[PDB]
């Protein structure tokens, strides 16, 4: 039973390499985004095997071939080990997130907010220090030890019954919202160094987000991606 769907997707794999917050974030403003918007880009990992761009669900997947200087590059994530074995249309499972540090002896901390909710983006002045509002909340902010790994299992929280691996409808009205599901995510995480904003360093520390799909259930048999002949 190594082809078992509950067995095959029940293993950890990479999703995204996101940057660690060192201040009160500004969540990326929805599309389209005009220039000059001061925000914080690529710090958020939208936990979905579907393609993303700027920590929001995307229609297509797009990487960069010649990343020149003009414009802000966008953190586009995809689950490569999923779609090559996702011969189905719908997929409900409970996510298991593991956040491995890519910085030597980093003390980080992993926030989360559910499918449909939003990041709390401000700061309160505790003891003349700008402590942001992502240290607190009713959602899991797991804290890592100095050089440790954050791991927890997230439930199927979204208001959709299943996650469409392939979707053909329109979430909002039409004209370029075709094939773009809105509520297909287990939520979003983000890493933050648990120090106030006056202790913001200068280096840009990354972190890596793993994913395990506990209790995978797949419906509606469909295709596998096209392999070229070159």
């Amino acid at each position: 039973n190594h082809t078992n769907v509950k067995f095959l997707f029940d293993r950890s794999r990479l999703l995204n390499v996101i940057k660690v917050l060192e201040k009160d974030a500004v969540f990326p403003r929805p599309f389209p985004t005009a220039t000059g918007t001061q925000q914080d880009d690529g710090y958020f990992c939208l936990l979905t095997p579907r393609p993303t761009v700027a920590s929001r669900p995307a229609t297509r997947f797009g990487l960069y071939v010649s990343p020149s200087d003009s414009g802000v590059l966008a953190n586009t994530s995809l689950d490569f080990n999923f779609y090559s074995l996702a011969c189905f249309t719908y997929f409900r499972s409970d996510l298991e997130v593991t956040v491995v540090s890519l910085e030597p002896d980093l003390e980080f901390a992993v926030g989360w907010f559910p499918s449909g909710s939003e990041y709390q983006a401000s700061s309160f002045v505790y003891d003349q220090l700008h402590v942001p509002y992502h240290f607190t909340g009713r959602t899991p902010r797991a804290f890592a030890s100095k050089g440790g790994k954050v791991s927890f299992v997230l439930p199927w929280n979204s208001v959709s019954s299943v996650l469409p691996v392939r979707w053909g409808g329109a979430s909002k009205l039409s004209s370029a919202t075709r094939g773009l599901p809105a509520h297909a995510d287990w939520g979003t995480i983000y890493a933050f160094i648990p120090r106030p904003n006056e202790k913001k360093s200068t280096a840009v520390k990354h972190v890596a987000v793993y994913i395990r799909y506990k209790n995978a259930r797949a419906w509606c048999p469909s295709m596998l991606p096209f392999r070229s002949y070159k």
Binding site: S12, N81, R227
Partner: protein, 230 residues
């Protein structure tokens, strides 16, 4: 008092495929029900057994085989039976099984004669074991495992390719896999010259499929090829 525990040598090690749970962070969530969706894929061997089209070089490849009217003592098509061979890249046998490491079972080539209705003739379907040189002559095709497919009531023939191997399982991404070369050769030969009626088109097309047998089994999931996305 405290239970005296001696921690092992793999302490604080996040292994990716650890067959065990982790701490729930956001428990007590009642998911919306999924009883309404039909066709739950419990097992991905429910889709290796579904006959999907093959490909043939004559990136525009052809699922059928043209049948020239020239009678000849050489195979009409003869592709090797290897699940890394590019006549299996876009099936559901060779696309599911390429992301694994071992297979065991019977590839089941389903034919479909797409010519006119009043065609009459016979075809020979010779599977060969892996020999040092590919069989070409129809006399070299009769001595192997064969089955004679007539264009009678059978406009659709499912030739079960046997599983003959010196090991219980086979390397599923390997050109050689065995003793010297290429793991076998299916070969559709034409046996009697094909009577096509006039005012019905010459050169018919035979459409090939590739399913898996009922005893087809897979083993050892490996990290897939992410080169479908470039």
């Amino acid at each position: 008092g405290p239970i005296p525990t001696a921690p092992r040598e793999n302490s604080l090690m996040f292994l990716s495929t650890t067959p065990d749970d982790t701490v729930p962070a956001y428990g007590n969530v009642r998911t919306p029900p999924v009883n309404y969706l039909p066709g739950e894929i419990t097992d991905l061997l429910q889709l290796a057994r579904i006959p999907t089209l093959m490909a043939f070089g004559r990136d525009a490849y052809v699922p059928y085989v043209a049948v020239p009217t020239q009678f000849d003592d050489k195979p009409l098509i003869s592709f090797p039976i290897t699940l890394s061979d590019p006549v299996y890249q876009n099936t559901l046998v060779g696309a599911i099984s390429s992301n694994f490491a071992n297979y065991r079972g019977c590839i089941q080539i389903t034919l479909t004669f797409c010519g006119p209705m009043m065609a009459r003739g016979k075809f020979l379907l010779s599977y060969s074991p892996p020999n040092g040189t590919q069989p070409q002559t129809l006399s070299e095709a009769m001595q192997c495992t064969y089955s004679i497919w007539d264009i009678g009531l059978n406009s659709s023939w499912t030739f079960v390719i046997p599983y003959i191997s010196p090991s219980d399982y086979r390397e599923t991404r390997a050109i050689t896999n065995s003793v010297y070369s290429a793991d076998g050769w299916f070969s559709l030969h034409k046996l009697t010259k094909i009577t096509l009626p006039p005012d019905c088109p010459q050169s018919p097309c035979i459409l090939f499929f590739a399913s898996a047998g009922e005893d087809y089994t897979l083993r050892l999931p490996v990290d897939c090829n992410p080169s479908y996305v470039f």
